[PDB]
Amino acid sequence: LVPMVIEQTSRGERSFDIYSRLLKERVIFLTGQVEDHMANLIVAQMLFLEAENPEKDIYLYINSPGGVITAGMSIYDTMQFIKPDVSTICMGQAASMGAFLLTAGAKGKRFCLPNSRVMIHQPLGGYQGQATDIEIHAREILKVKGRMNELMALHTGQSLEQIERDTERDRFLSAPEAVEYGLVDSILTHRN
């Protein structure tokens, strides 16, 4: 069930849900495993907010263990294409594609909760078939791994070699460690 909130305005009472009410304030949610259906929905929300106001910041809370890499790339392109700066805040956890999107936000606007956790790992795939087909798929996944590493180094500011070594295996970093690594900028502990 989704609670229905009411917003008081001069025109009159308006009916909205919990998610819709926050969307009107330029807020987006990224919950559940990343896929084509959910990823497309997020992209649509970003486009709508840009048309309403191409200057106000668009928030996006990332809370998911990850999902399809291809689906996640669409969200990254939209964030870097729309003029409004996308502010990403990590809530709960952000692993696999979630971690990549966390560091993809506008510089100086990335935040995370004090107890949030971010995990980064190399791309996961796999193909079965003839030898020739397996070779093509192996090259494709390798190329995606290199591109992802370069993008990560661009935001976090670390060297390309450092990112590759740290992505060889799953790496768990707490909120304080994320700031030093470069994934996020500051930590939102209490409202001031």
Binding site: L47, F48, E50, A51, N53, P54, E55, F81, K83
Partner: protein
Amino acid sequence: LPTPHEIRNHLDDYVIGQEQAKKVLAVAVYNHYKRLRNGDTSNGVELGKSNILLIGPTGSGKTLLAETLARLLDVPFTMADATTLTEAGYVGEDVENIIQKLLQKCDYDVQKAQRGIVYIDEIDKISRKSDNPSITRDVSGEGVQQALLKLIEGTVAAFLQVDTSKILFICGGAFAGLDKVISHRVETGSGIGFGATVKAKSDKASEGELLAQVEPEDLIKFGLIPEFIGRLPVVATLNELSEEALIQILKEPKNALTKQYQALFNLEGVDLEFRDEALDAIAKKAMARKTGARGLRSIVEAALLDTMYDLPSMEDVEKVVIDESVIDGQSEPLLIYG
């Protein structure tokens, strides 16, 4: 009798930053004088009456244009505010007295008064309004507009009967709120996809461009009766003074407020000078206020408020120097003792 170039040259001596406004007004007024010179109008086609409408943002100088053109012309020129105009048979000032005001200014010269010009200011104030919460009888409103339309169209009414068909009529008044209807019609929707044109709210067409494109339906929706709009084929639209125009009006004019304060301090034997880097800073601040030329006086008054509060009390004062920092509030005005 004066060519459009002559009126423009002498008109800019007082008004600044309105070259387009003076060009349209000069052409329309010049054409009317040509018809008056030779009223036979042998041509089959009868040119419509050339009535110029002065519409623009507050403080642009619409009333200033009316006064400046009066000096150049020798025909009688009387100014009447529509606020006092009311329906006949009431304590309010009758609208039929406007024509009389033109005769008195001409020394009762009815023969020479038929070629006069009358200007009306604050026309938007008499826009028809719903008489629901109004007083028992809406003396002021659509009644004044309809009565004026009688003379604009051309009728003989009284003294000696005077024909208003050939009497040039010029309208004025700053239409407050008309920019909302104009912007609503011209503005179009914006797409949401990647291949869509998205315009930021800050990067919105200035009010000057919106007024440059107007349609009769906008005036009718504002309150003006539809017949009144048709009678004014010429619509001279003004534009808000730009930053470059504000600085010019701040120094070039003989009665510039800058020199007004300088003479004010001369009473006690003190004088002040405004640095060039400070004149432009004052102009930009005035533009933010959106009050036109009137905002320049307020800005300088506040900046010099402290100077006038303690200068007379102090002794051994010779000169005062004000720069951009002083007006911006960063530091206090400089003063050299002597």
